[PDB]
Swiss-Prot record, chains A, B, C, D:
Family under the similarity heading: Belongs to the UPF0045 family.
Stored Gene3D superfamilies: 3.30.70.930
Keyword Nucleus: yes
Record keywords: Cytoplasm, Nucleus
Gene: ECM15
NCBIfam families found in the cross-reference section: MTH1187 family thiamine-binding protein
Species assigned in the record: Saccharomyces cerevisiae (strain ATCC 204508 / S288c)
GO cellular component, one term: cytosol
Name of protein: UPF0045 protein ECM15
Note: Present with 1900 molecules/cell in log phase SD medium.
A Pfam family: Thiamine_BP
Localization in the cell: Cytoplasm; Nucleus
Ranges that cross the membrane: none
Assembly with partners or alone: Homotetramer.
Length: 104, 104, 104, 104
């Protein structure tokens, strides 16, 4: 169980539901993610979660189990995650650097 | 060249640069993306682009070529893209539905 | 319409079907991919397609339209794509280099 | 620490190295992955790992730490992971079903 800091952007969708509309599933998991003390930011194509590796990946796993507990039979997830040793950077720090450079 | 409407969230990074810091590359490509008439939204883990398939995928390809033109030798990209026939939904519509349901 | 060579690994899934089992959809799209003259390699988590950017992204777009034509209401796709200017490398060349180094 | 079975296809790349060529990094991590008792399958665009969630995500985290221990300053990873309650399916079972259907 590694504890390295990481930034993980997750996009989770249910497979096999009766409708192409899945906002119920997204809202369901988002509420669960916001209950965690880990910092998270919701956007249109997913949610960015930050913190120690084990806690972040642990939460995503719990969300899957939560989905299954709520009746969803299959969950498909895409995770973009990065770790680095040169500096500590939150999701907000990341966008702040870009925005600054763009206006320059 | 398909023209179906699509929502594509792209995360692009350069491989082989001399530094772990890549905000220069991100800012460079973001400015190029904002020059397009296609609707785009920047977030911490990528940029969401919407429009006809050929125009969206065409732009991403142009960004790659632009990166190479600017000296970057290798570009690695992750794209999450979806198409649907039941309704038209922009990236903003998508987050709006979730936010509403979350407060309900 | 960029024509830079690219290697794209695609994972495509249908959203809103009546079953968690989606092998019918996968088989359907795979047969369509094999009809293209572009080089493709199927694996457990997707299919790797190579060739000019416009032809590769064009095919993926056609697959989406094909899915919708076959009754699927929503398609979600994850694409990992890379371009580079230092050498030409097929998907097979890529795995060959790794395998060699592993035994060394 | 969830223990639900999962199939995870991982694509890991180093950011900030002095070369666009990263086969050394890939070979390095692959050897580390093969030391694990977890079932893994290497392909051109990544490696598919299967097993309990905590063990699989734990290994990926260890690979990141291993990369940093070996001098790599930044690691970027894309993970496609799925869980389901309707059946147990390995990566090989997954491709076997498709291949069968394709010839039918």
């Amino acid at each position: 169980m590694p504890k390295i800091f990481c930034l993980a952007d997750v996009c989770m969708v249910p497979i096999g539901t009766d409708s192409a509309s899945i906002s119920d599933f997204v809202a369901l998991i988002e509420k669960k993610i916001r209950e965690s003390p880990l910092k998270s930011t919701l956007h249109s194509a997913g949610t960015t979660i930050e913190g120690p590796w084990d806690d972040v990946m642990g939460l995503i796993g719990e969300i899957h189990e939560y989905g299954h507990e709520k009746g969803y039979v299959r969950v498909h997830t895409d995770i973009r995650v990065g770790t680095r040793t040169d500096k500590h950077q939150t999701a907000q720090d990341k966008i702040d650097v870009v925005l600054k450079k763009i206006s320059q």
